[PDB]
Every structure is written in C-alpha cells, then in structure tokens.
Amino acid sequence: ASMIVVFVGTAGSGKTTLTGEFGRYLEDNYKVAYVNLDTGVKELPYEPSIDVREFVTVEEIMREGYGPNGAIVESYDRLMEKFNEYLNKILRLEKENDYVLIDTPGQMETFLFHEFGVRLMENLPYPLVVYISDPEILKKPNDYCFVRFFALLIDLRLGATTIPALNKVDLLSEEEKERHRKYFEDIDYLTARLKLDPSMQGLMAYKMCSMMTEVLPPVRVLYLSAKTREGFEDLETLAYEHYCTC
Amino acid sequence: ASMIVVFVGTAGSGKTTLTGEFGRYLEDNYKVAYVNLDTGVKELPYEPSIDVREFVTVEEIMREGYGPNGAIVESYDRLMEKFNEYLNKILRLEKENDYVLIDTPGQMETFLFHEFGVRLMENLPYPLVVYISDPEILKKPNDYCFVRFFALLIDLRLGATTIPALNKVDLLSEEEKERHRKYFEDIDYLTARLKLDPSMQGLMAYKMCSMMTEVLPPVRVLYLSAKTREGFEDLETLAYEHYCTC
C-alpha cells in the first residue's frame, strides 16, 4: 500500500492541522500513519506512530540553559543519535500502510539545513513533499514567484517532488481566491506581469521565474483547507499519480 | 557616509560573531552602528544602537504560555507595533554613520516570512545583504547549487543585492578550501559536474543552476572568518562597489 506524504511549511501555515485533517479524510479508504518530527510543537491533533518529543523536546533543553534558537538546533543534533532507528521505524510504517503522513519541524529551516531532516528525507522511497503557504504572504506579483521558487529549492534540497499549496483558502473572499489562481495557473500572465516594475528589482524579478518556467513544466498549485476539506481529492490523486510516474 | 550591511544566515552560521568582528575591522577607518533584530539571541559580542530585546524577548513570551516555535512568531508580531519607530531609528543611524551593520533573526525564516523583517528591508536605501553558510552544508555538487539558489531567493524576497559567503573558513583544511572554491568560482565546471548523477534528481538538478547561470552574471562567493579576518577587505570593497553601482 506504501506511500509517504511530507508536509513542509513555515511557522503559522497550519500544516499540523492539515496533516491531521487530511489523515481522517484518508482514514476512510486507507490505512494511515502519522509521523511527528517537530520537537517544539505543544499539542498535536492526531495519533502519532512516531513522535520525536518522547526522545527530546525544545523546552527540556531550555530547562538546561539554551537560548531558544540554540535549543531547536540542539534538539535536532540529539535526534541524529537515533537517526538510524527513526529511519527504520518509518520504513516499517511505510509498508504497513497506505499512507504515512509526515509532519516536519515548524522552523522549516531545521528541515532544510540540519542533517536529520535532510538525510532522513533522502533515504525514503520517493516521498511526496507538500509545501504549504499562508496565502497572506501573497500581496503582489513578487510574492508569487518566490513561492514557486522556494518550492523548487526545497525540492532540490530534499530530492523529492515538492508540490506548492495554499492552506486556509476557506478564509479567502472569492475576491482573493480569484486573484491568486490567475497569478498562479496562467503562467503567461504573471510571467508577463513581471515587467510593470521598473527598478533594479522590478526587472531581474522578471527574468527569474521566466526561465525556471522554461526548463521543466511547472506544477499545479493546490488550494487546501483543513476546515472545509477543499483540495483533499486533488492531493489524494496527486499522491497516486506520483506513486505511478516514478 | 551612509551604508547598510545586512547579515543573513541560519542558526549556527556564526554571523553574530562575524557582525561583531567585521565591525571592529571597520571601526578603524569608519564610524559604525550595530542593529540587532533577533529576539531570542542571549548575549551579543557588540554594542547595539538598536536591540529589539529591550522591547521583547522570546523567553518573556514563553513565560506566558507559548510553544517555542509560537513565541518567535509572537515576538515578531509585537515588534511590528513599533515598526515605524524602528525604521526611523535605522534611517537616522544610516546617515550618522559610514556603516550600519544589521544582525537579523537566527531563524532566517522570521526574516524571510514575517512582515517586520520583510517590510523593514524593503524600506531601506539599497541595503547590502550577506548570506553566510556553514561550509559543512557543503558535502557534494548538490549542496553548492542550493546555496547560489537560496541567495537568489533571499535577494528576490528582500529586494536587496544578496552576496553568498562561507564563514569559519579558518576551520577548513586547505584540502576542503581547495574543494569549495573549485565548485564555486569555476562556473563551467560545477555547471558540468551536475550530470554524473543519473536519477530523477540527478538530472533536474543540472538544468537548475544551468539557467539561473545564464540570465544575470552570477556573483563571487566571499570566504570569511571572524577569527582570522579572512575576507573583510573583500566585503569592504564589495560594500563600496555596491554603493557605487546602484
């Protein structure tokens, strides 16, 4: 049955709530496992098969003299001592299930930059990555290219197909909803909207997502909502489509 | 005299030690101001003109019930209430000095993603960004393209020339020192080293920094060391060169 979905997203994207809700959505026609890799998240809305807080939490470490930024890094360093264990735990789940959903660190960068996250990921069988954004980071043509770009970066970094998505689209007025898809799905509209800006940066910014766009056929952005279950069917089949075309 | 240098880098890059040391290096032929924007860093090796911890620290906030990841975000939300104040504080320093050095959050992403960092930056006069990496993230041809890429991303994000650099090169055996420059400065060697990898990712990865490379003449990577002062003269003149060509 075997299939892994990694939720990546920055502090305040609501991806722990998504991981939870998307699981129950799956729990109806599928066996599902939940993996928590975040050492500093308080509560979790699901039942974890693997929960690294058992082994170490950011606070325990602070309760030993570390500045907050230094205690996240230090939680991930200690995790690596159980590196092989956690890998093999995950590999077991992978083929005892249809879906293993993986919830990554809230500081996205202790997943991009620390050894644990990075090595873990590059030793899993063709995992699917979902990069979710608060659609608020989306104010103007600039905000849109950065998101495609950063998804490309994560992909590069983890060596895993990374699909970009917006979460909490149920909070969007159709006003905004309209505005975002246009900019996202009509490549040759945004790719041309990046010229009405005449400044050191209102020019480069244009030749940026201009190429990345002309190399490997870009991806569809997912619109998701833990609250309405908008987009679950889509991601469901993107998962399956991914399991095929690999 | 006016000139701003923003040090960006992830938890464990040693850029607070760099900001400190590069300042004294400058303090000999220049008037210099130090700006700390990190709410969770304990001690600082310099004298801050602006220190946001006066107004709020990550711990005070934790001492009120926030999970660590939620207390960084919450420190930056409260900062934005003094947004205009901090902007004007910085603008005053800018032309009371030759250099204002700015030390950004240790969680690089509360600078890329929160409103404070991002808006602050895009309202400063042509600031220079220095992206520093622990050269350990550098193991193989992949690690190298990601770094160029991510510097491009920051640049895009903040609308500021962003220069990539390695810090702590004094810890490098000449063995490694040799190895990194080759991969970094001989474009058409790494840009061709990205083909001896035959896998979903050992192929895309090649067409990645292949284009970005063919659009706008790439940048020289700086090798820096707070401990030996390797690279200071270089960055010094890159600062000046930047102040010119703008």
Ligand SMILES: Nc1nc2c(ncn2[C@@H]2O[C@H](COP(=O)(O)OP(=O)(O)OP(=O)(O)O)[C@@H](O)[C@H]2O)c(=O)[nH]1
């Ligand atoms: N309206 C709406 N609210 C949501 C949705 N998803 C999450 N929320 C709310 O926003 C909060 C997000 O919480 P989490 O899912 O834990 O966020 P997170 O991504 O784990 O946060 P970090 O760990 O910092 O990355 C929840 O408490 C929900 O109340 C959504 O789809 N729609």
Ligand SMILES: Nc1nc2c(ncn2[C@@H]2O[C@H](COP(=O)(O)OP(=O)(O)OP(=O)(O)O)[C@@H](O)[C@H]2O)c(=O)[nH]1
């Ligand atoms: N050998 C050597 N050691 C260094 C150098 N720079 C910093 N260090 C050491 O590494 C540590 C880095 O500390 P910081 O400069 O505060 O690191 P930082 O970038 O502020 O860390 P974050 O806030 O998490 O991003 C220091 O305590 C130094 O002892 C260097 O250039 N060479």
